[PDB]
Amino acid sequence: QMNVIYIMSDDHTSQAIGAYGSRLAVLNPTPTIDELARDGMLFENCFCTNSISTPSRACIMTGQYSHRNKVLTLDEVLQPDQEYLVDEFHNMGYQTAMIGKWHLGCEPSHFDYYSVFNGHGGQGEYFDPTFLTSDVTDKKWPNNQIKKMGYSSDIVTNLAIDWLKNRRDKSKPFFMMHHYKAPHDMFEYAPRYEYYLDDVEVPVPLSLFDTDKWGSEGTRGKNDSLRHFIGTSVSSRHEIRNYVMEYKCNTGDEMENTYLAYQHYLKSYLRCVKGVDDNLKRLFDYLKKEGLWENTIIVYTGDQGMMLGEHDLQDKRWMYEESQRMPFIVRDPRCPYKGAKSDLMINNIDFAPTLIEMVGGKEPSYMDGKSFASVFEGKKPENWKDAVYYRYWMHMIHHDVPAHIGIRTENYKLILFYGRHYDDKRYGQKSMSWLKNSHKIVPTLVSFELYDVKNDPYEMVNLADNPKYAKVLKDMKKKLRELRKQVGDTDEAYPELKKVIDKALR
């Protein structure tokens, strides 16, 4: 039986992996991950269905869309009973281990072993982190706490190596979820990376300074009346929260301020990515010397993408390419296609059924996702989707990003900004409750955005109001309407929202 190590980093976006060939690849940000891809298979079209940490991690654990597993936003939690991925590996006779960033709210009690960050409600600390572990029995969750000195990414790797070396029953296969907290904000990189990239300019995206044709009334207001309201920024654009403010840039020139904030944002972030990559070298080295390299499936992914200043945006949540796409690399030692790429349209909800089938199990019939394990034997899965669904539910909270649904085909992306919160008690409350002058949660404008992701991969040009694209827009609206029906996301429980979305889709 094959062992499995599922490695996932927090907010590690595809621009920041060398193998994905973004503007950042010239910096060689992830040599170890790149080498893994050269001996594995890289997936070009892997998409989150809902880009924030907790909803994505719930989709991964349950194989189910947010509207099915009910973990809609960061405000909801998983139930232990919903730990389906690990239940399935248990039922197949695996010993199971959960290491690192959990962030699902509940105890990882369906694991045989866990040691997961607890600082700041499951967010963890970059230095001297404490962990909740199934080894502390003197106390009950969430109080079975231990503390480790030093840098988190180094400690996380040590927890995994320790379990493999000292705790695993070598007579049984293992399934391990190995989750780094880096490169999540605040990007507190380890001191030894202080001068990494010191002499280099990080390539700047044109869209940081030019948004002329991007967006719509739903993301900008009419005539940009909401340009300082919607969407936190790298520049001074967003009036409440942005990196120019956060990094205290004040050169006398706002464009220079933006450039300097982008450089500090990207360099701090990439120094955290480098710490993860260096740590992967240690882990992979260990697996190789232990004789596990050729009997262990290894996955490397990030729970969602992140806006690294494209369109002058930050964080995730948006359906735009950099936030929707997850990097996703799998090395199955039995797969003969080494260094291959796959363009199959996949979602984070497909991870669990695929892994289960990879080791000989059956695709679970209660999951929304399906298994693409046949790709590793050189065959597209039967009747596989050629489009993906997306919905961000957490209207305006944290980053002033309006709620939206969308569909991405291989050629076009249609986004419907419906601009409502599913819990109308939240209207009027602060979107960022730690700030005295936060904006308030309010309904925003309904609008469509249509991007040609093949000829405009950076989503520079919203086509929804171009009359040359009237038929494409109608065709994609029909597909969005049907896909929403196909996946069961029809809002009978939220009639406020159902009326708005049904009306917009004709």
The residue count of the chain comes to: 506
Residue 10 Cβ, how far from Na ion at the closest point, in Å? 5
Which residues within the stretch 73-132 sit at the binding site for Na ion (CB under 5 A)? Answer: none
**Host H or E run for residue 176:** strand 174-180
Nearer to Na ion, 55 or 406 (CB): 55
332 closest CA partner among 294, 388, 279: 294
The tally of CA atoms less than 13 A away on the side-chain side of residue 3 is 22
Nearer to Na ion, 316 or 404 (CB): 316
Strands (E) across 271-365 are located at: 296-302, 328-331, 340-342, 346-347
Q: In b/e form, how buried is each residue of 261-280, taking b as 16+ CB within 10 angstroms?
A: bbbbbbbbbbbbbbbbbbbb
Nearer to Na ion, 104 or 450 (CB): 104
Give the count of residues interacting with Na ion (CB under 5 A).
4
Question: CB–CB of 46/346 below 8 Å?
Answer: yes
Stretch that binds Na ion, among 11-19, 116-124, 236-244, 432-440 (CB under 5 A): 11-19
Residue 104 Cβ, how far from Na ion at the closest point, in Å? 12
Residue showing the smallest CB distance to Na ion in the complex: 53
Nearer to Na ion, 51 or 219 (CB): 51
Residue 100 Cβ, how far from Na ion at the closest point, in Å? 12
Of residues 4, 6, 10, 318, which one binds Na ion by CB under 5 A? 10
Residue 271 Cβ, how far from Na ion at the closest point, in Å? 18
Q: What track of x and - describes contact with Na ion for positions 301 through 340 (by CB under 5 A)?
A: --x-------------------------------------
Residue that the structure tokens 């205290």 belong to: 248
Which residues within the stretch 21-60 sit at the binding site for Na ion (CB under 5 A)? Answer: 53
Q: How far is CA 292 from the centre of its chain?
A: 28
Residue 382 Cβ, how far from Na ion at the closest point, in Å? 32
Task: Give the strand pairing for 3-9 and 174-180.
Answer: parallel
Nearer to Na ion, 10 or 368 (CB): 10
- Residue-wise DSSP of 390-458: EEE---STTT----EEEEEESSEEEEEE----S-GGGTTSBSSTT-TTPPB------EEEEEETTT-TT
The whole-angstrom separation of Cα 217 and Cα 391 is 19
Which residues within the stretch 269-308 sit at the binding site for Na ion (CB under 5 A)? Answer: 303
Residue 303 Cβ, how far from Na ion at the closest point, in Å? 4
Nearer to Na ion, 182 or 450 (CB): 182
| Footprint of Na ion (CB under 5 A) | 10-11, 53, 303
